[PDB]
């Protein structure tokens, strides 16, 4: 057990440490801290696999050390693991340090845990003091006034580090640190440091001043925002670095909720427009993702106007955007605007945009319209809207690129369900049957599964009268791969079609195919009988199934007669 530690075998060290919690159960819970932990301090240099396991383990060791009275001796090993120069084992040690901090009595905090934070924050290498930034949150609420005071100046120092990595780290935890301060220490300490990081030299730092900007916004009262936050947020949305502007757009709906319904109108609306018009496509994409969600969260009164007057004219220009990734990003959500703008406005203003997007070159655009028809269906009739859907459904189905075809096959059962039960027959029946003759297996395999879904949505009488005829007819296809497809179809169809239709129509065509010249088909005839065997009555099996299966076992091909008698496994 102890020998599994100092192994050279990589797997044996994992099952030794990932099972470390039960060695402390066996070894004295008193002995654990006097023997075990000393060894787990200054011997551990291994794979970043086992080190991620150790940090993980020490997070729960809180009880097995003797409870809160002896937590402070889980610190030396975790202090070492917050030094290792890996950005996964480090912030896993920070995980476990944050966890067991709550287990420290306020006196024990000041005695051990603060001193740790202090040392890590004064570390020579940056790795140390980047881990330190995470520890101020869990520390600060419970310690003394003097220690609070010290902890604040220690954070101010991390915020103005020499290295960008640290003041990146400091800005990323600036939100959580302000949440635990006092209202007018936020005004005095945080705001300046928030302002200072927001206009940092490196855009890698300024980046994190946006989701930090959100936090500082939620803590303040509305009055203060215009004074303290807004100037900073404004300079950000207009940052020269496009990555910073991306973050403003990425965190937009949550910036909206933070500044409340008032500044949303005044400042955010003009800013959103400016984002939807950004020179970098990444940003326009990001902003487009937030349209239905941002329009949703406008104040119940001044919204229906602002959407129509401020949001809409931008959208129109985005629909013609010279970037597929934008066009499609918008297309994904654009339709959720209907259960907000009502019936009348959708037909006048939203509808021509759907039809424009529907006749769009990019497949993934007009694909996204299809994925979200239920949005519009419940307030607008999918009636004359349908006329424009066909030319798009066909082009998606007949597209040279195969990943495109797999995509519309996916949406097909749901798309028939919201269209015409009958409409399907005239217009779409052709298209689904054509996917069974396809050069890609992935398409045929999807297309067969597709019609077993379609039976669900139309019942067995429909299948009997629309599909099964055309399906079976394929038994007479010159190429054996289409014949083979017929058997595969018969498998998935037999289950949803009952007994009478499977016995009287489907089974006949299966049995005939047993004399197929292509060996490859004959065995799939046997293998096919297995799956349809049970859904027959015990007489038809003895009648016409048993004699054919026996014939196939006397076949010249090795693998034919294999699957053949292996079917008589469910016979005799």
Coordinates of C-alpha atoms in Angstrom, one line a residue:
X1 CA 0.0 0.0 0.0
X2 CA 2.8 2.4 1.0
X3 CA 4.9 0.8 -1.8
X4 CA 2.4 2.1 -4.4
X5 CA 3.5 5.6 -3.7
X6 CA 7.2 5.5 -4.7
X7 CA 6.3 3.5 -7.8
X8 CA 7.8 4.2 -11.3
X9 CA 4.6 2.9 -12.8
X10 CA 2.4 5.8 -13.9
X11 CA -0.9 4.0 -13.3
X12 CA 0.0 2.7 -9.9
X13 CA 0.7 6.2 -8.5
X14 CA -2.8 7.3 -9.7
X15 CA -4.6 4.4 -7.9
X16 CA -2.5 5.3 -4.9
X17 CA -3.4 9.0 -4.6
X18 CA -6.9 8.9 -6.1
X19 CA -7.4 6.4 -3.2
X20 CA -5.4 8.5 -0.7
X21 CA -8.6 9.3 1.4
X22 CA -8.8 5.7 2.6
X23 CA -5.1 5.4 3.7
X24 CA -5.9 8.1 6.2
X25 CA -8.8 6.0 7.4
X26 CA -6.5 3.0 8.0
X27 CA -3.5 5.0 9.2
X28 CA -4.2 6.8 12.5
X29 CA -6.3 9.9 11.9
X30 CA -3.9 11.3 14.5
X31 CA -0.9 9.7 12.8
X32 CA -1.9 11.0 9.4
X33 CA -0.7 14.5 10.2
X34 CA 2.4 13.4 12.0
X35 CA 3.7 10.9 9.4
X36 CA 1.8 11.1 6.1
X37 CA 1.6 14.8 5.3
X38 CA 5.4 15.3 6.0
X39 CA 6.1 12.9 3.1
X40 CA 3.5 14.5 0.9
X41 CA 5.3 17.9 1.1
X42 CA 8.8 17.6 -0.4
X43 CA 8.8 14.3 -2.4
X44 CA 6.1 15.1 -4.9
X45 CA 7.6 15.9 -8.3
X46 CA 5.7 13.8 -10.9
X47 CA 3.3 13.9 -13.9
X48 CA 0.9 16.9 -13.9
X49 CA -1.6 14.1 -13.7
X50 CA -0.9 12.9 -10.1
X51 CA -0.2 16.5 -8.9
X52 CA -3.7 17.4 -10.1
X53 CA -5.0 14.4 -8.1
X54 CA -3.1 15.4 -4.9
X55 CA -4.4 19.0 -4.8
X56 CA -7.9 17.6 -5.5
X57 CA -7.5 15.1 -2.6
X58 CA -6.2 17.6 0.1
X59 CA -9.4 19.6 -0.5
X60 CA -11.4 17.1 1.4
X61 CA -8.8 15.9 3.9
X62 CA -10.2 18.5 6.3
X63 CA -11.9 15.9 8.5
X64 CA -9.3 13.1 8.3
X65 CA -6.6 15.4 9.8
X66 CA -8.6 16.0 13.1
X67 CA -11.2 18.6 12.1
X68 CA -10.8 22.4 12.2
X69 CA -8.3 22.2 15.0
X70 CA -5.7 20.7 12.7
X71 CA -6.6 22.1 9.2
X72 CA -3.7 24.5 9.3
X73 CA -1.3 21.7 8.5
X74 CA -2.8 21.0 5.1
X75 CA -1.3 24.4 4.1
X76 CA 2.5 23.5 3.6
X77 CA 1.7 20.8 0.9
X78 CA -0.9 23.0 -0.9
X79 CA 1.5 26.0 -0.7
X80 CA 4.0 23.9 -2.7
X81 CA 1.3 22.9 -5.2
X82 CA 0.4 26.5 -5.7
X83 CA 4.0 27.0 -6.9
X84 CA 4.2 24.3 -9.6
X85 CA 4.3 26.1 -12.9
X86 CA 1.2 24.4 -14.4
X87 CA -2.0 26.5 -14.7
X88 CA -4.2 23.5 -13.9
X89 CA -2.5 22.1 -10.7
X90 CA -2.0 25.7 -9.4
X91 CA -5.7 26.8 -9.6
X92 CA -6.6 23.4 -8.3
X93 CA -4.5 24.0 -5.2
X94 CA -6.2 27.4 -5.0
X95 CA -9.5 25.4 -5.2
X96 CA -8.5 23.4 -2.1
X97 CA -7.1 26.4 -0.3
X98 CA -10.3 28.3 -0.8
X99 CA -12.2 25.2 0.4
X100 CA -10.4 24.6 3.7
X101 CA -10.2 28.3 4.5
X102 CA -13.8 28.2 5.7
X103 CA -12.7 25.5 8.1
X104 CA -10.3 27.8 9.8
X105 CA -11.4 29.5 13.0
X106 CA -11.1 33.3 12.7
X107 CA -8.1 33.1 15.1
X108 CA -6.5 30.2 13.1
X109 CA -7.1 32.2 9.8
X110 CA -4.9 35.1 11.1
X111 CA -2.5 32.6 12.6
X112 CA -1.7 30.5 9.4
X113 CA -3.9 31.3 6.4
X114 CA -3.2 35.0 6.1
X115 CA 0.6 34.4 6.5
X116 CA 0.4 32.0 3.6
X117 CA -1.5 34.4 1.3
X118 CA 1.1 37.0 2.3
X119 CA 4.1 34.8 1.4
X120 CA 2.6 33.6 -1.9
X121 CA 1.8 37.2 -2.9
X122 CA 5.4 38.1 -2.2
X123 CA 6.8 35.2 -4.2
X124 CA 9.7 35.6 -6.5
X125 CA 8.2 33.8 -9.5
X126 CA 4.9 35.2 -10.9
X127 CA 3.2 31.7 -10.6
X128 CA 3.2 32.2 -6.8
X129 CA 1.5 35.5 -6.7
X130 CA -1.0 34.7 -9.4
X131 CA -2.3 31.9 -7.2
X132 CA -2.4 34.4 -4.3
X133 CA -5.0 36.6 -6.1
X134 CA -7.6 33.9 -5.6
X135 CA -7.2 33.7 -1.8
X136 CA -8.1 37.2 -0.8
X137 CA -11.9 36.5 -1.2
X138 CA -12.2 33.6 1.2
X139 CA -10.0 35.3 3.7
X140 CA -11.1 38.8 4.2
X141 CA -14.6 38.7 5.8
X142 CA -13.7 37.0 9.1
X143 CA -10.3 38.4 10.0
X144 CA -9.4 41.5 12.1
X145 CA -9.6 45.2 11.1
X146 CA -5.8 45.5 11.0
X147 CA -5.5 42.3 8.9
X148 CA -8.2 43.5 6.6
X149 CA -6.2 46.7 6.2
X150 CA -3.0 44.7 5.5
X151 CA -4.8 42.4 3.0
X152 CA -6.0 45.4 1.0
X153 CA -2.5 46.9 0.5
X154 CA -1.2 43.4 -0.4
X155 CA -3.8 43.3 -3.2
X156 CA -3.1 46.8 -4.4
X157 CA 0.5 45.6 -4.8
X158 CA -0.6 42.6 -6.9
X159 CA -2.7 44.9 -9.1
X160 CA 0.3 47.0 -10.0
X161 CA 2.7 44.0 -10.5
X162 CA 5.6 44.1 -12.9
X163 CA 4.3 41.2 -15.0
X164 CA 1.1 41.3 -17.0
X165 CA 0.3 37.7 -16.0
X166 CA -0.2 38.8 -12.3
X167 CA -2.2 42.0 -12.9
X168 CA -4.2 39.9 -15.3
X169 CA -4.8 37.6 -12.4
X170 CA -5.5 40.5 -10.0
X171 CA -8.1 41.9 -12.4
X172 CA -9.8 38.5 -12.7
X173 CA -10.4 38.3 -9.0
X174 CA -11.0 42.1 -8.5
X175 CA -14.8 41.4 -8.9
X176 CA -14.9 38.8 -6.0
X177 CA -12.7 41.0 -3.8
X178 CA -15.0 44.0 -4.1
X179 CA -18.0 41.8 -3.2
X180 CA -16.5 41.2 0.3
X181 CA -15.3 44.8 1.0
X182 CA -17.4 47.6 2.5
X183 CA -19.5 49.9 0.4
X184 CA -17.2 53.0 0.7
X185 CA -13.9 51.0 0.6
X186 CA -15.1 50.0 -2.9
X187 CA -15.5 53.7 -3.7
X188 CA -12.0 54.4 -2.3
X189 CA -9.8 51.4 -3.1
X190 CA -11.5 49.3 -5.8
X191 CA -12.7 52.0 -8.3
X192 CA -9.1 53.4 -8.7
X193 CA -7.6 50.0 -9.2
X194 CA -10.5 49.0 -11.5
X195 CA -9.9 52.3 -13.5
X196 CA -6.1 51.6 -13.5
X197 CA -6.4 48.0 -14.9
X198 CA -9.0 49.0 -17.4
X199 CA -6.5 51.3 -19.1
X200 CA -3.6 49.0 -18.7
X201 CA -0.8 48.8 -21.2
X202 CA -1.5 45.2 -22.1
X203 CA -4.8 44.4 -23.7
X204 CA -4.6 41.0 -22.0
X205 CA -5.3 42.9 -18.7
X206 CA -7.8 45.4 -20.0
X207 CA -9.8 42.4 -21.3
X208 CA -10.7 41.2 -17.8
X209 CA -11.8 44.7 -16.7
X210 CA -15.2 44.0 -18.4
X211 CA -16.4 41.0 -16.4
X212 CA -14.9 42.8 -13.4
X213 CA -16.8 45.9 -14.6
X214 CA -20.0 43.8 -14.3
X215 CA -19.4 42.9 -10.7
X216 CA -18.5 46.5 -9.6
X217 CA -21.8 47.5 -11.3
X218 CA -24.0 45.1 -9.2
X219 CA -22.5 46.3 -5.9
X220 CA -23.0 50.0 -6.4
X221 CA -26.4 51.8 -6.4
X222 CA -27.7 53.2 -9.7
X223 CA -26.9 56.8 -8.8
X224 CA -23.1 56.1 -8.6
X225 CA -22.8 54.1 -11.8
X226 CA -22.6 57.2 -14.1
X227 CA -19.8 58.5 -12.0
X228 CA -17.7 55.4 -11.2
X229 CA -18.3 52.7 -13.8
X230 CA -19.7 54.1 -17.0
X231 CA -16.7 56.2 -18.1
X232 CA -14.6 53.0 -17.8
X233 CA -17.1 50.8 -19.6
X234 CA -17.4 53.4 -22.4
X235 CA -13.6 53.6 -23.0
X236 CA -13.7 49.8 -23.2
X237 CA -16.5 49.3 -25.8
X238 CA -14.3 51.7 -27.8
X239 CA -11.0 50.0 -27.0
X240 CA -8.5 49.8 -29.8
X241 CA -7.9 46.1 -29.1
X242 CA -10.7 44.2 -30.8
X243 CA -10.4 41.4 -28.2
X244 CA -11.5 43.9 -25.5
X245 CA -14.5 45.0 -27.6
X246 CA -15.4 41.3 -28.0
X247 CA -15.7 41.0 -24.3
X248 CA -18.0 43.9 -24.0
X249 CA -20.2 42.2 -26.6
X250 CA -19.7 38.8 -24.9
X251 CA -20.8 40.2 -21.5
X252 CA -23.5 42.4 -22.9
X253 CA -26.8 41.0 -21.5
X254 CA -25.2 40.7 -18.1
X255 CA -23.8 44.2 -18.4
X256 CA -27.5 45.2 -19.2
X257 CA -28.8 43.5 -16.0
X258 CA -26.1 45.1 -13.9
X259 CA -26.6 48.8 -15.0
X260 CA -30.4 48.3 -14.8
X261 CA -33.1 49.3 -17.3
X262 CA -32.3 53.0 -17.2
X263 CA -28.7 53.3 -18.4
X264 CA -29.5 50.4 -20.8
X265 CA -31.5 52.9 -22.9
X266 CA -29.2 55.8 -22.5
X267 CA -25.8 54.3 -23.1
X268 CA -26.0 50.5 -24.0
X269 CA -28.5 50.9 -27.0
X270 CA -26.1 53.3 -28.9
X271 CA -23.2 51.0 -27.9
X272 CA -24.8 47.8 -29.1
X273 CA -25.5 49.4 -32.5
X274 CA -21.8 50.3 -32.6
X275 CA -20.8 46.7 -31.9
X276 CA -23.2 45.4 -34.5
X277 CA -21.2 47.6 -36.9
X278 CA -17.7 46.7 -35.7
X279 CA -14.9 46.3 -38.3
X280 CA -14.0 42.9 -36.8
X281 CA -16.4 40.1 -37.7
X282 CA -15.6 38.2 -34.5
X283 CA -17.3 41.0 -32.6
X284 CA -20.3 41.4 -34.9
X285 CA -20.9 37.7 -34.5
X286 CA -20.7 38.0 -30.7
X287 CA -23.1 40.9 -30.7
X288 CA -25.5 39.1 -33.0
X289 CA -25.8 36.2 -30.5
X290 CA -27.2 38.6 -27.9
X291 CA -30.0 40.2 -30.0
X292 CA -33.1 38.3 -28.9
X293 CA -31.8 38.2 -25.4
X294 CA -31.0 41.9 -25.1
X295 CA -34.2 42.9 -26.8
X296 CA -36.1 40.7 -24.3
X297 CA -34.6 42.6 -21.3
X298 CA -35.6 46.1 -22.3
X299 CA -37.9 47.8 -19.8
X300 CA -41.5 46.6 -20.4
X301 CA -42.6 50.0 -21.5
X302 CA -39.8 51.6 -23.6
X303 CA -38.8 48.4 -25.6
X304 CA -41.4 47.6 -28.3
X305 CA -40.4 51.1 -29.7
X306 CA -36.6 50.8 -29.2
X307 CA -36.5 47.3 -30.8
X308 CA -38.4 48.6 -33.9
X309 CA -36.5 51.9 -34.0
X310 CA -33.0 51.3 -32.8
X311 CA -32.3 47.5 -33.0
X312 CA -34.2 46.6 -36.2
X313 CA -32.3 48.9 -38.8
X314 CA -29.0 47.4 -37.6
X315 CA -30.3 43.8 -37.9
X316 CA -31.4 44.5 -41.5
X317 CA -27.8 45.4 -42.4
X318 CA -26.5 42.3 -40.6
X319 CA -28.7 40.1 -42.7
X320 CA -26.7 41.3 -45.8
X321 CA -23.4 41.0 -43.8
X322 CA -20.4 39.9 -45.8
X323 CA -19.5 37.2 -43.3
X324 CA -21.2 33.8 -43.0
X325 CA -20.2 33.4 -39.3
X326 CA -22.1 36.7 -38.6
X327 CA -25.1 36.0 -40.9
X328 CA -25.5 32.5 -39.3
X329 CA -25.0 33.7 -35.7
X330 CA -27.9 36.2 -36.2
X331 CA -30.0 33.6 -38.0
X332 CA -29.9 31.4 -34.9
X333 CA -31.7 33.8 -32.7
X334 CA -33.4 36.3 -35.0
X335 CA -36.6 34.2 -34.9
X336 CA -37.0 34.5 -31.2
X337 CA -37.9 38.2 -31.8
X338 CA -41.5 37.2 -32.8
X339 CA -42.9 36.2 -29.3
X340 CA -41.8 39.8 -28.3
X341 CA -42.9 41.9 -31.3
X342 CA -46.3 40.2 -31.5
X343 CA -48.1 39.2 -34.7
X344 CA -48.6 42.4 -36.7
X345 CA -45.0 43.6 -36.4
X346 CA -43.5 40.2 -37.3
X347 CA -45.3 40.1 -40.6
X348 CA -44.4 43.7 -41.5
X349 CA -40.9 43.9 -40.2
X350 CA -39.4 40.5 -39.3
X351 CA -40.9 38.3 -42.1
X352 CA -39.0 39.9 -45.1
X353 CA -35.8 39.3 -43.1
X354 CA -36.6 35.6 -42.7
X355 CA -37.2 35.2 -46.4
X356 CA -34.0 37.1 -47.2
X357 CA -32.0 34.8 -44.9
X358 CA -33.8 31.8 -46.3
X359 CA -32.6 32.5 -49.9
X360 CA -29.0 33.0 -48.5
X361 CA -26.0 31.3 -50.1
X362 CA -24.5 29.9 -46.8
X363 CA -26.3 26.6 -45.8
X364 CA -25.7 27.0 -42.1
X365 CA -27.6 30.3 -42.2
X366 CA -30.9 29.0 -43.7
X367 CA -30.3 25.8 -41.7
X368 CA -30.6 27.9 -38.5
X369 CA -33.9 29.4 -39.6
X370 CA -35.3 25.8 -40.0
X371 CA -34.0 24.8 -36.5
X372 CA -36.2 27.5 -35.0
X373 CA -39.5 27.6 -36.7
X374 CA -41.5 26.9 -33.5
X375 CA -40.6 30.4 -32.3
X376 CA -42.6 32.0 -35.1
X377 CA -45.2 29.2 -35.5
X378 CA -47.0 30.0 -32.3
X379 CA -47.8 33.6 -33.3
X380 CA -47.6 33.5 -37.1
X381 CA -49.2 30.9 -39.4
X382 CA -46.7 28.6 -41.0
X383 CA -49.0 28.8 -44.0
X384 CA -47.7 31.1 -46.8
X385 CA -44.4 31.1 -44.9
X386 CA -44.0 27.5 -46.1
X387 CA -43.9 28.5 -49.8
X388 CA -40.4 29.9 -49.3
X389 CA -39.2 27.0 -47.2
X390 CA -39.3 24.4 -50.1
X391 CA -36.6 25.9 -52.4
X392 CA -34.3 26.0 -49.3
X393 CA -35.1 22.5 -48.0
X394 CA -34.4 21.1 -51.5
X395 CA -31.1 22.9 -51.9
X396 CA -30.0 21.8 -48.4
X397 CA -30.9 18.2 -49.3
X398 CA -29.3 18.2 -52.8
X399 CA -26.1 20.0 -51.5
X400 CA -22.8 18.6 -52.8
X401 CA -21.2 18.9 -49.3
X402 CA -22.3 15.9 -47.3
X403 CA -22.2 17.4 -43.8
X404 CA -24.8 19.8 -45.1
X405 CA -27.1 16.9 -46.0
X406 CA -26.7 15.0 -42.7
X407 CA -27.7 18.3 -41.1
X408 CA -31.1 18.7 -42.8
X409 CA -31.9 15.0 -42.4
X410 CA -31.4 15.6 -38.6
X411 CA -34.2 18.3 -38.6
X412 CA -36.4 16.4 -41.0
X413 CA -38.8 14.5 -38.6
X414 CA -39.4 17.7 -36.6
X415 CA -39.8 19.8 -39.8
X416 CA -42.4 17.5 -41.3
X417 CA -44.2 17.6 -38.0
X418 CA -44.7 21.4 -38.1
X419 CA -45.4 21.4 -41.9
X420 CA -48.3 19.6 -43.6
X421 CA -49.0 16.0 -42.7
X422 CA -50.2 16.0 -46.3
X423 CA -47.8 18.7 -47.5
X424 CA -45.0 16.2 -46.8
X425 CA -46.4 13.7 -49.3
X426 CA -46.6 16.0 -52.4
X427 CA -43.3 17.9 -51.9
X428 CA -40.9 16.1 -49.5
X429 CA -41.6 12.4 -50.0
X430 CA -39.4 12.5 -53.1
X431 CA -36.5 14.0 -51.2
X432 CA -36.4 11.5 -48.3
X433 CA -36.5 8.5 -50.7
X434 CA -33.5 9.9 -52.6
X435 CA -31.3 9.9 -49.5
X436 CA -31.4 6.1 -49.6
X437 CA -29.5 6.2 -52.8
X438 CA -26.4 8.1 -51.6
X439 CA -22.7 7.7 -52.0
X440 CA -22.1 8.4 -48.3
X441 CA -23.1 5.7 -45.9
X442 CA -23.6 8.3 -43.1
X443 CA -26.4 9.8 -45.1
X444 CA -28.2 6.5 -45.9
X445 CA -27.8 5.5 -42.2
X446 CA -29.4 8.7 -41.1
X447 CA -32.0 8.6 -43.8
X448 CA -33.2 5.1 -42.8
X449 CA -33.4 6.1 -39.1
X450 CA -35.3 9.2 -40.5
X451 CA -38.3 7.3 -41.8
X452 CA -38.6 5.2 -38.6
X453 CA -39.0 8.6 -36.9
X454 CA -41.5 9.7 -39.6
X455 CA -43.7 6.6 -38.9
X456 CA -43.9 7.8 -35.3
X457 CA -45.2 11.2 -36.6
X458 CA -47.7 9.9 -39.2
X459 CA -48.8 6.4 -38.0
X460 CA -48.6 3.0 -39.6
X461 CA -51.4 3.5 -42.2
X462 CA -49.5 6.3 -43.7
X463 CA -46.3 4.2 -43.9
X464 CA -48.3 1.4 -45.5
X465 CA -49.5 3.7 -48.2
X466 CA -46.6 6.1 -48.9
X467 CA -43.2 4.6 -47.9
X468 CA -43.3 0.8 -47.9
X469 CA -44.1 0.4 -51.6
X470 CA -41.2 2.7 -52.7
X471 CA -38.9 1.1 -50.1
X472 CA -39.5 -2.4 -51.3
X473 CA -39.3 -1.5 -55.0
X474 CA -35.5 -1.1 -54.2
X475 CA -35.2 -4.9 -54.0
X476 CA -34.9 -4.7 -57.8
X477 CA -32.1 -2.2 -58.0
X478 CA -29.1 -3.4 -60.2
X479 CA -26.6 -2.2 -57.6
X480 CA -26.6 -4.5 -54.6
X481 CA -25.9 -1.7 -52.1
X482 CA -29.4 -0.2 -52.8
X483 CA -30.9 -3.7 -52.4
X484 CA -28.9 -4.1 -49.2
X485 CA -30.4 -0.7 -48.1
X486 CA -33.9 -2.2 -48.5
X487 CA -33.2 -4.9 -45.9
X488 CA -31.8 -2.2 -43.5
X489 CA -35.0 -0.2 -44.0
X490 CA -37.2 -3.2 -43.4
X491 CA -35.4 -3.8 -40.0
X492 CA -36.2 -0.3 -38.7
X493 CA -39.7 -0.2 -40.2
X494 CA -40.9 -3.6 -39.0
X495 CA -40.9 -2.5 -35.4
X496 CA -43.2 0.5 -35.9
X497 CA -45.5 -1.0 -38.5
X498 CA -47.1 -3.8 -36.4
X499 CA -47.6 -7.4 -37.5
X500 CA -50.1 -7.5 -40.3
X501 CA -48.1 -5.1 -42.5
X502 CA -44.7 -6.7 -41.6
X503 CA -46.1 -10.2 -42.3
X504 CA -48.1 -9.6 -45.5
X505 CA -45.9 -7.1 -47.4
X506 CA -42.4 -6.8 -45.9
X507 CA -41.6 -10.5 -45.1
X508 CA -42.4 -11.6 -48.8
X509 CA -39.7 -9.3 -50.2
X510 CA -37.2 -10.3 -47.6
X511 CA -37.5 -14.0 -48.4
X512 CA -37.2 -13.5 -52.2
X513 CA -33.9 -11.7 -51.7
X514 CA -32.4 -14.9 -50.2
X515 CA -31.5 -16.1 -53.7
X516 CA -29.6 -12.8 -54.5
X517 CA -26.5 -13.6 -56.6
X518 CA -24.5 -11.2 -54.4
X519 CA -23.3 -13.2 -51.3
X520 CA -23.2 -9.8 -49.5
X521 CA -27.0 -9.5 -49.7
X522 CA -27.9 -13.1 -48.8
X523 CA -26.3 -12.9 -45.4
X524 CA -28.1 -9.5 -44.7
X525 CA -31.2 -11.5 -45.6
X526 CA -30.6 -13.9 -42.7
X527 CA -29.4 -11.1 -40.3
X528 CA -32.6 -9.3 -41.3
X529 CA -34.8 -12.2 -40.3
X530 CA -33.5 -12.1 -36.7
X531 CA -34.8 -8.6 -36.1
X532 CA -38.2 -9.2 -37.7
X533 CA -38.5 -12.8 -36.3
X534 CA -40.1 -11.9 -32.9
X535 CA -42.8 -9.5 -34.3
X536 CA -44.2 -12.4 -36.3
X537 CA -46.6 -15.0 -35.0
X538 CA -45.2 -18.5 -34.2
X539 CA -47.0 -20.0 -37.2
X540 CA -45.5 -17.9 -40.0
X541 CA -42.0 -18.7 -38.6
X542 CA -42.7 -22.5 -38.9
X543 CA -44.4 -21.8 -42.2
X544 CA -42.2 -19.8 -44.5
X545 CA -39.3 -18.4 -42.3
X546 CA -37.8 -21.7 -41.0
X547 CA -37.5 -23.4 -44.5
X548 CA -35.6 -20.4 -46.0
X549 CA -33.2 -20.0 -43.1
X550 CA -32.4 -23.7 -43.5
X551 CA -31.7 -23.2 -47.2
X552 CA -29.2 -20.4 -46.5
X553 CA -27.2 -22.7 -44.2
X554 CA -26.3 -24.9 -47.1
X555 CA -24.8 -21.8 -48.9
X556 CA -21.4 -21.7 -50.6
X557 CA -20.4 -18.5 -48.7
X558 CA -18.8 -18.9 -45.2
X559 CA -20.4 -15.8 -43.6
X560 CA -23.8 -16.4 -45.2
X561 CA -24.4 -19.7 -43.5
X562 CA -22.9 -18.3 -40.3
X563 CA -25.6 -15.6 -39.7
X564 CA -28.1 -18.1 -41.2
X565 CA -28.1 -20.9 -38.5
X566 CA -27.5 -18.2 -35.9
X567 CA -31.0 -17.0 -36.8
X568 CA -32.4 -20.5 -36.0
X569 CA -31.1 -19.7 -32.5
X570 CA -34.3 -17.8 -32.0
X571 CA -36.2 -20.6 -33.9
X572 CA -35.3 -23.9 -32.3

